[PDB]
């Protein structure tokens, strides 16, 4: 099965420009037509444009076509979204997906993978990692043989973080909750994971914060306190 | 463009109940020649692209369970979610590739309706790295409830903040149905070291009575 891989999260100035890259796994763009899906928050799913790299033609919306331009790299099966003089309304998830027309010419393959998606954030904030701080299990976070411990994300700019723990050995009870923009114009989140009560002296309990925009990686460990 | 107009925008029902979405749109998506229908059903759940459902306006994608099921032709299409089970907890869009330019429907955000379930009330107080800096956060944790309707309130030494904390609600979780909520209370160390109790009071459907969780400094 053909997988496509996106470019990282990216903050970017008013008025820049930016590019969003899209691997098409294969080895070969064949006769797909490789689409741009914008999710903005409160807007749905949009339609942008799609690309066929093969015949070097591309179609848009109306709301993008005079602001985006759609490239490809077939040296390396590189799918590019060129966006122009964003503003604060393009913060959006970015998805690349092979998705096709009746109209133009799909060759078949009207659907296919989708890209993990690419969060851009339109913003002059700087770049800021995270502080990282244990949320420390106690009596007070305990209810019989179930108790909460977590990581306290804090002041980061812009999203996301990911956050694992045991790196990725802990799954089950983990919620990682939406990040709340603050009162300072950071972004704040908390991890929390439910553990049985009697593990809490003996099994150890790490969270794993990335933070890609800033490259901060940054492992705590949560004891109790 | 052919608009799709999706119904309903939110939908709560019951594990095991049959949940019906419905879209029309503008203009026929239907080829003459072959009598296919280019209308596809995506799911979306937290955190992951879309995931094609259906096809061809009732062709079922191959891993999809066969509970899911599209219907309609032309301009009218369904989406039929049978016995419906936790991991059914997702956004619906419909979607047209007739014509260009694409056009999804708005999405039909799916939420299941279980028992209701009180929270576990914890309480963390602030690290001391943290208080190694100005700033000091307090964390309310409301864990595993439904419904989503919760009431967090903070009292420092009794007096009712407002102002100086946000909360955070998780996606609907796919396994037990539940939310878990977080209320972080932040004081600068100055003005948390003035004070000895912190107070976070929950009021819930599945509680009792308003339950109160506390710690002193």
């Known amino acids: 099965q053909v997988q496509l891989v996106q470019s990282g999260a990216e903050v970017k100035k008013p008025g820049s420009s930016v590019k969003v890259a899209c691997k098409v796994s294969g080895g070969t763009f064949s006769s797909y037509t490789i689409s741009w899906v914008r999710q903005a928050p409160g807007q749905g799913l949009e339609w942008m444009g799609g690309?066929?790299?093969?015949?070097?033609?591309?179609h848009y919306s109306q709301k993008f076509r005079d602001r985006v331009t759609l490239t490809a790299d077939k040296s390396t099966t590189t799918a590019f979204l060129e966006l122009s003089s964003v503003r604060s309304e393009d913060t959006a998830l970015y998805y690349c997906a092979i998705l096709g027309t009746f109209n133009w010419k799909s060759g078949g393959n009207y659907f296919g993978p989708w890209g993990q998606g690419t969060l851009v954030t339109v913003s002059s904030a700087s770049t800021k990692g995270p502080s990282v701080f244990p949320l420390a299990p106690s009596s007070k976070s305990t209810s019989g043989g179930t108790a909460a411990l977590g990581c306290l994300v804090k002041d980061y700019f812009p999203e996301p973080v990911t956050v694992s723990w045991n790196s990725g050995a802990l799954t089950s009870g983990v919620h990682t909750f939406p990040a709340v923009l603050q009162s300072s114009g950071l972004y704040s989140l908390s991890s929390v994971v439910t553990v049985p009560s009697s593990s809490l002296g003996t099994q150890t309990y790490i969270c794993n914060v990335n933070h890609k925009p800033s490259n901060t990686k940054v492992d705590k460990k949560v004891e109790p306190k | 463009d052919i608009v799709l107009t999706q119904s309903p925008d939110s939908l709560a029902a019951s594990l095991g109940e049959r949940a019906t979405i419905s879209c029309k749109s503008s203009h026929s998506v239907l080829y003459s020649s072959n009598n296919k229908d280019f209308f596809a059903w995506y799911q979306q759940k937290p955190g992951q692209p879309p995931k094609l459902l259906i096809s061809w306006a009732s062709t079922r994608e191959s891993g999809v369970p066969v509970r899911f099921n599209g219907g309609g032709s032309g301009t009218h299409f369904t989406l039929t979610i049978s016995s419906l089970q936790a991991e059914d907890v997702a956004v619906y869009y419909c979607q047209q590739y007739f014509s260009s330019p694409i056009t999804f429907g708005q999405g039909t955000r799916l939420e299941i309706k279980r028992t209701v379930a009180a929270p576990s009330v914890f309480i963390f107080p602030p690290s001391d790295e943290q208080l190694k800096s100005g700033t000091a956060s307090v964390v309310c944790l409301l864990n595993n409830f439904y419904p989503r309707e919760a009431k967090v309130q903070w009292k420092v030494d009794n007096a009712l903040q407002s102002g100086n904390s946000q909360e955070s609600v998780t996606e609907q979780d796919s396994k037990d149905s539940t939310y878990s909520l977080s209320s972080t209370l932040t004081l600068s160390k100055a003005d948390y070291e003035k004070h000895k109790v912190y107070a976070c009071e929950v009021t819930h459907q599945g509680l009792s009575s308003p339950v109160t969780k506390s710690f002193n400094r």
């Open positions: 690309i066929i790299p093969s015949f070097g033609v591309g």
